[PDB]
Amino acid sequence: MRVLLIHSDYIEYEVKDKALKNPEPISEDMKRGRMEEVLVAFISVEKVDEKNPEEVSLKAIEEISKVAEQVKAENVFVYPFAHLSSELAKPSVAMDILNRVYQGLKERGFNVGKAPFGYYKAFKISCKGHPLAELSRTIVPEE
Amino acid sequence: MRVLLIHSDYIEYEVKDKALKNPEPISEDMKRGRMEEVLVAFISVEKVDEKNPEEVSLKAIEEISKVAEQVKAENVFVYPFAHLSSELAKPSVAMDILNRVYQGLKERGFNVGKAPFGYYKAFKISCKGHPLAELSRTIVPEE
Ligand SMILES: Nc1ncnc2c1ncn2[C@@H]1O[C@H](COS(=O)(=O)NC(=O)[C@@H](N)CO)[C@@H](O)[C@H]1O
Ligand SMILES: Nc1ncnc2c1ncn2[C@@H]1O[C@H](COS(=O)(=O)NC(=O)[C@@H](N)CO)[C@@H](O)[C@H]1O
């Protein structure tokens, strides 16, 4: 799994066209959303993660939170992102890992937001541009 | 090399403090920058690229130019971004290839923009959300 953590003044999106045959069904409220003083996490679930989803989700949860501490971010937004990896994971496994992380983040006490999986979204992001405001992580299962 | 192409409504940046002992020397102008209706290219120059510098820059120029024609982009913005790869290139080689890309992209006639190299920058971007607004390319030499 490949993560891109960007501490933003805000993140905002809008669901345009579908990018898959069967994207995550969403209710009206999810068609768009906005989060402020947030740590944005663009995540590319990779094929190797299909071996051990739990270890990879739990591992990513601990690494996202750690950084949410460092930058004193109270809100974390999970952004399903397909362009951080070449070897992407099967759509079904991606959604699953992303939910695991989303949920596991919610139970850590963070206000968590999320962009709907499987769609093309337009979006605005404002990176704070500080020393630790931009990080990248790799979370892969152990053999 | 790794490239993240965001066809955005706009791209804005603002220089903070040096993220390197020896960053690209800039003038009062280079401190802030705004560009609209542009294809933002977040480029991570990799170690592998050190090998053949002129080769990489060429395929890169070509790939970005082609994507710009598809999306009818007239303005291209090259953004030095060191988070799309774990095997980054030495700061001197990374900076050269970036300038070859910047330069050879202007030769094509595009209106090109650039974010100073070696600085922590706060930035704002607005992805369009079209099928071709978010793209990724892995351009690597063949020794
Ligand atoms: N492995 C993944 N990790 C994160 N998101 C994914 C993943 N696979 C699919 N998605 C979701 O589905 C969207 C499109 O996925 S995609 O793999 O890029 N789709 C394709 O390559 C082709 N359908 C052409 O668009 C991603 O932007 C994301 O919203
Ligand atoms: N390989 C690279 N590709 C693109 N930009 C780079 C690269 N190396 C350095 N830079 C430029 O210099 C900035 C900092 O680079 S860096 O790789 O993160 N530096 C380091 O890892 C250590 N020197 C500590 O700062 C990047 O944000 C970018 O502006």
Side-chain angles (χ1 to χ4, degrees), chain A residues 1-17 19-143, chain B residues 1-17 19-143:
Chain A
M1 176 193 276
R2 283 217 39 59
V3 179
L4 176 57
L5 299 170
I6 296 185
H7 191 197
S8 321
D9 297 291
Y10 63 83
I11 172 68
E12 190 187 70
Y13 72 86
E14 168 194 358
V15 172
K16 306 268 292 187
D17 296 21
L20 260 48
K21 241 61 153 49
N22 289 313
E24 161 191 297
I26 60 176
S27 34
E28 183 67 25
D29 257 305
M30 296 167 81
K31 287 184 175 182
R32 56 174 77 222
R34 179 195 167 84
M35 202 154 251
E36 286 169 37
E37 300 304 336
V38 56
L39 168 66
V40 185
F42 294 101
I43 302 172
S44 271
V45 187
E46 301 175 306
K47 179 54 67 167
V48 295
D49 305 303
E50 318 190 332
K51 283 299 187 178
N52 185 13
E54 191 185 299
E55 166 172 283
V56 169
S57 293
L58 305 193
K59 198 174 302 183
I61 293 175
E62 193 51 282
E63 264 309 299
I64 298 291
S65 307
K66 199 186 173 195
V67 177
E69 294 296 318
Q70 287 168 53
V71 308
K72 296 166 169 47
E74 191 69 56
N75 328 301
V76 168
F77 185 99
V78 173
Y79 202 110
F81 204 57
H83 311 80
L84 299 183
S85 185
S86 291
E87 262 77 312
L88 300 169
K90 168 165 293 304
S92 52
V93 180
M95 273 177 85
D96 175 47
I97 309 289
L98 294 172
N99 176 234
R100 286 173 138 78
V101 173
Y102 173 57
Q103 301 302 323
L105 247 25
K106 286 205 303 179
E107 47 211 15
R108 282 299 195 85
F110 291 107
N111 181 216
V112 191
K114 62 186 272 292
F117 182 101
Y119 299 81
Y120 287 126
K121 275 96 56 183
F123 72 93
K124 299 181 174 184
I125 183 175
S126 182
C127 182
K128 295 208 195 301
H130 298 312
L132 312 166
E134 308 183 64
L135 310 174
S136 67
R137 298 266 181 286
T138 291
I139 313 297
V140 301
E142 291 167 291
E143 298 102 305
Chain B
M1 190 182 279
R2 286 300 300 274
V3 180
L4 178 55
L5 304 165
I6 307 292
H7 182 204
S8 319
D9 290 300
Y10 68 80
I11 173 74
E12 180 176 66
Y13 81 82
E14 181 167 297
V15 169
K16 316 278 272 184
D17 283 308
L20 275 160
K21 180 179 181 62
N22 296 285
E24 135 169 59
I26 73 306
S27 59
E28 190 44 57
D29 294 346
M30 291 182 253
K31 282 184 176 175
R32 81 201 70 284
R34 172 89 176 179
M35 195 172 235
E36 314 177 324
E37 238 45 64
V38 58
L39 176 74
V40 181
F42 289 98
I43 302 178
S44 280
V45 181
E46 299 171 301
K47 191 69 66 175
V48 176
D49 313 320
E50 283 176 34
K51 297 285 93 284
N52 206 298
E54 166 169 281
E55 190 193 314
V56 175
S57 310
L58 287 164
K59 296 174 177 180
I61 294 288
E62 169 57 49
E63 280 312 294
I64 302 173
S65 299
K66 180 157 53 203
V67 180
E69 311 271 40
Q70 300 182 46
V71 305
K72 283 47 166 287
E74 312 249 72
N75 304 309
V76 177
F77 199 89
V78 182
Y79 196 111
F81 190 68
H83 305 290
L84 302 181
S85 165
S86 306
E87 295 63 42
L88 296 175
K90 160 202 294 288
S92 64
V93 185
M95 184 167 84
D96 172 40
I97 293 173
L98 278 185
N99 290 180
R100 305 174 98 108
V101 177
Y102 173 72
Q103 281 141 53
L105 212 45
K106 309 191 73 189
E107 156 64 275
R108 297 296 191 81
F110 297 105
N111 176 242
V112 189
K114 67 182 292 181
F117 187 98
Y119 291 89
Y120 287 109
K121 287 94 64 189
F123 68 90
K124 335 255 288 311
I125 186 177
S126 194
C127 175
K128 288 185 171 306
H130 302 309
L132 297 157
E134 276 176 47
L135 298 176
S136 61
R137 307 275 137 134
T138 297
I139 299 169
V140 287
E142 317 189 66
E143 310 87 5

